[PDB]
Ligand binder design. Structure first.
Ligand SMILES: [Rh+]
Ligand SMILES: [Rh+]
Ligand SMILES: [Rh+]
Ligand SMILES: [Rh+]
Length: 129
């Protein structure tokens, strides 16, 4: 599924991400935009052989099992394919574990490089929330 910007903002807010670990909703929408362009089906291979999955590009090195990432962890207890659903529940609940792991949203290199320090409120401008 490719979400609309406000549609994704609303689903993220309903699933508890607005100010989760102090990250305003615009941070999560900004991260999703640069990670997946709001596409739940997005996949990208990492240089280490792991793969990033879904709207928040959650990796198989630590967070999910894709059956092909050797010496990796499954800390969200999910098949990576669950992260590609039209239903973002698995991505959101796994993102809450990631962002609590010590590095906050710096865990998302795209967030640090494209969202951190920017006017992220712009990502929810004009949405009914
Ligand atoms: Rh908020
Ligand atoms: Rh809010
Ligand atoms: Rh939902
Ligand atoms: Rh509201």
């Amino acid at each position: 599924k490719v979400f609309g910007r406000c549609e994704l903002a609303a689903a993220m807010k309903r699933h508890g991400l607005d100010n989760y670990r102090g990250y305003s909703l615009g941070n999560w929408v900004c991260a999703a935009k640069f990670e997946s362009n709001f596409n739940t089906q997005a996949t990208n291979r990492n240089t280490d052989g792991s793969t990033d999955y879904g709207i928040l590009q959650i990796n198989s090195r630590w967070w999910c099992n894709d059956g092909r990432t050797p010496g990796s962890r499954n800390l969200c207890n999910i098949p990576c394919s669950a992260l590609l659903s039209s239903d973002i529940t698995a991505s959101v609940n796994c993102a809450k574990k990631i962002v609590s792991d010590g590095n906050g949203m710096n865990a998302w290199v795209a967030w640090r490089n494209r969202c951190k320090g920017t006017d992220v409120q712009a990502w929810i401008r004009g949405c009914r929330l």
